[PDB]
Each structure stands twice: as C-alpha cells, then as structure tokens.
Amino acid sequence: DEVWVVGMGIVMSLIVLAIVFGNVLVITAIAKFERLQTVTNYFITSLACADLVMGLAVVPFGAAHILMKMWTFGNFWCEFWTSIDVLCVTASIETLCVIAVDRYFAITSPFKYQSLLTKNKARVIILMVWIVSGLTSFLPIQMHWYRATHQEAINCYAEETCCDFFTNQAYAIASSIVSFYVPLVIMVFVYSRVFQEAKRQLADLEDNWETLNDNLKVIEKADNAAQVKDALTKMRAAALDAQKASPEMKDFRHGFDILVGQIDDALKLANEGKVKEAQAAAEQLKTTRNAYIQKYLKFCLKEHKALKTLGIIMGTFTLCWLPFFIVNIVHVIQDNLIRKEVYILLNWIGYVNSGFNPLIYSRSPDFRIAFQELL
C-alpha cells in the first residue's frame, strides 16, 4: 500500500524543516549581535553547525534510502553519506560533553574560570573536537577500514544499489565508545557535580538569610544597646558570608554591598550609643530585605528552572541516543537478536535530537529576547 510512503514522508519533511530552521535561528544572532558572543556560545554555535550539517546531509539523503527501494546516487556518495553521518553524530555528542565541562568549570572554581580561557582556547577546543570526530568517522570508512565478515554484506560492498551499514566488532565498539560512552560518562559525572554545587549554593544562601531575619526581628524589640550591637554584628557577618557566596550576579553583589553598607551604618550608630537611631536603621534594613524577596523569588525560580534543566538535558539526550548505542553493540554480537527496522527507528530517534537541541540550549532570557526581532 501507499501508507508507508505518504504517512512517513510528511513527518520526515517536517523534521528536516524544523531542524534546519532551528539551527539557522541559533547560528544567527550569535555572531551578529553583541552580548551573545561568549565562550559558551562558541561551543553552542559548533553544536548548531553540526546539527545543521546533519539535518541537510543525512536526514534527506538518508530518507531517500527509505520509502523507495535502493541507492541511486553512487558508491562514493554512499561512503560520503555514511562518513558525514558518523561525523555529525560524534561532533554533536562531543560538543554536548564540552558544553557540560564548560558549565562545570564555570560553577566549580569560578574565579579561575573568570579568565583562564579566551576565544583562542575555545576555538582550539572546537577544532580538536571536530578533528577527533573526523578521524573517528571519515578515516575508517572512505578507505574501508570497518569491513564485515558476512555474505549479505559482500553483496552490498561491491554492489552499487545498496547502502546498508555492516561494521566490524572493533569498529562498532570503538565508535560507540568514542561517540557516546566516553561523553556519557564525562557528562554524567560533570552534571552530577554541578547539581550538588548548585544545591549547596542555594542552601547556604537561604541559611544566611534566615539568621539575618532572626537578627532583624530581635533588633525590632531589643531593649538596650548591647543587644542591638550583637545582633547587628551577627547580621553583618552573615551578610558578608552571603555576599562572598553575568549581570545577574553583578546586581546580586551590588545589592549585598548596599545591605552591608546599611548594616555598617546601623552598627556604628549602635556602637556610638544611640539605640533609637540603630532601630531606625534596622527599619531601613527591613525595607531592604523586603526589597530582596522579589528578586530572589525570580532567581530561585530560574535556579529550579535550570535544575529541571539537568533533567531535561539528561533525559532528552539519553532517551534519544542511548537506545541506539545499546542496540548497536547488541547487534554486532549475537547479530540474530536484532531486527533491521528497529535499528533504523532507533537511529532516527537519535537523528531527531538535532531539532530538540536548539529548544534545550536556547532557553535563556538573552536568547529569548534576541530571537524575537528575527521571528
């Protein structure tokens, strides 16, 4: 029947269109607009470039191998399509793990990360990633280093109208390890460490502010100057500790600078012996802390939003690529337990992650405001 053709042609066309549109949207406004040229954006644009080339190359030409019968482009073009597929997949996963490592270095030891790498270092990392993926993909294919030991694969290597993908045990295992498993382990450990540090930051911040509120409350009904002085000393210590623990961080530190200044004025007034003026400055401190939790409601919201992030990134990447890289190994060993159509389906579930990546890595306020003017 014609159901197999028309039912699944439209979804493939829509997938290609979504992939190309998202990738050209992400690539644009990174190099054009200011405030969007950062070291992390250098990895993001490489990921977008890999997704774009994969969406133009292997999705349309690969779908051509589907629906209709066989290959009508050429054996050299078959090798080129296979090589570019492996290159794009490997480059995308390596770029994902590089972005993970970038976030880890940003969160862990932020002072060193403030200036340790520049555009030159990020570009060097990008070229290293891309050349590693190319060595993994192009080199073992176009001169037939994967080969096979099957009688229904020899009738395809020396026959034009066929583009199956039969590889040796060593090549399949090495490609799975380089492309997916090493990045999987690296990014799992990286994002687990990033999760813990973020939890601990929000935790210390919320503690500090509890003792700030308690000290302010005890000042509100304090009797003598000694109680006000002691409570203001504890408030100053906790405020400095919270200050010690992006323009958002700049505003955060500026607000804590204002709070520390007001606390210092209150403490000096209390030290001089004027309890009433100390209580008035404490009322001003109450105004400041009330002004705080409008901003922290927003920022605690953004933080639990990127904590869901860990979930969204990990779940999407794993659910998209892990089934394919498990079936790939369990297919080269005990080959008769694996069916071809489910192999193609699991590979296309990996393919469709190309259109998902822009919708996972562009959910920032700067990217959101930049995307509007292009539309």
Ligand SMILES: COc1ccc(C[C@@H](C)NC[C@H](O)c2ccc(O)c(NC=O)c2)cc1
């Ligand atoms: C019906 O037979 C076929 C024919 C072609 C394919 C697409 C394949 C070239 N894409 C391979 C996939 O895209 C990929 C990506 C990254 C990798 O590291 C490896 N490794 C394989 O050993 C494989 C699939 C099944």
